Amino acid sequence: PQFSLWRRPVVTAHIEGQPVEVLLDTGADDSIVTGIELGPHYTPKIVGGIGGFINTKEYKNVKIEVLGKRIKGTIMTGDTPINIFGRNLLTALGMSLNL
Amino acid sequence: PQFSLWRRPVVTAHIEGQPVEVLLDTGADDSIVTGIELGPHYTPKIVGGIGGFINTKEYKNVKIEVLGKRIKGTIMTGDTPINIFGRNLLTALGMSLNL
Ligand SMILES: CC(C)[C@H](NC(=O)[C@H](Cc1ccccc1)C[C@H](O)[C@H](Cc1ccccc1)NC(=O)OC(C)(C)C)c1ncc[nH]1
Ligand SMILES: CC(C)[C@H](NC(=O)[C@H](Cc1ccccc1)C[C@H](O)[C@H](Cc1ccccc1)NC(=O)OC(C)(C)C)c1ncc[nH]1
DSSP: EEESSSSSEEEEEETTTEEOOOOOOEEEEEEEOOOOOOOOOOOOEEEEEETEEEEEEEEEEEEETTTTTTEEEEEEEOSSSOOEEOHHHHHHHHHHHHH | OOSSSSOOOOEEEEEEEEEEEEOTTOSSSSSSOOOOOSOOOOOEEEESSOOEEEEEEEEEEEOOOOOOOOEEEEESSSSSSSSSEEEHHHHHHEEEEOO
């Protein structure tokens, strides 16, 4: 599809069956979400942005369904004020920025 | 053009004469640059990032040249880890996000 950017590109995705709305972020390296419980097998991390750093819980090989595609990829869960899908999940779907 | 998001979409902008590497960001409602100072006539703002709230200096009608275009926009200066061109300049340039 084409997101023209006059509204925030918010899309509904299913992460291991849970339904969540996420912002398609070209400015983020990772996809950080909150509100899904994915289990005790994570690698602890810390990522930065406008306002400072945040501790994350990284999970690899996660079943993701977003925009008619189904991919497997790394999602981080943490206290992020906005759910985000960064370039690691946008490249898996083959999305791109066009001029 | 098309940017495939495998590498961070950073380009060169010349904000009112001055050269700056900026990140093409769809997750951003505004554009915030650091390391340039645009002057005393600004309106203070607060915007929220991932680590929390920052204060920015907002300058309206800033002439910009990115890719082959000469546009005018609102640029904010503040404490960002990376210079970002958000949805207000991307729509001005006419860029889209596609799958
Ligand atoms: C939530 C994350 C995905 C996103 N942050 C990033 O993409 C940031 C952008 C950034 C660039 C340069 C310095 C600091 C931060 C990247 C992550 O913080 C850091 C970058 C970094 C490296 C070394 C020390 C400190 C930071 N990278 C990261 O976590 O993952 C990689 C893929 C590079 C290993 C962000 N963008 C906007 C708001 N938050
Ligand atoms: C470049 C900044 C503006 C950007 N922040 C935003 O886009 C933020 C965050 C956001 C993104 C997506 C969905 C909801 C909220 C919106 C801005 O913070 C705020 C909205 C807001 C203000 C006060 C309290 C709460 C929200 N917008 C803003 O200052 O600019 C306008 C002119 C649109 C009002 C950011 N920081 C890190 C990544 N993106």
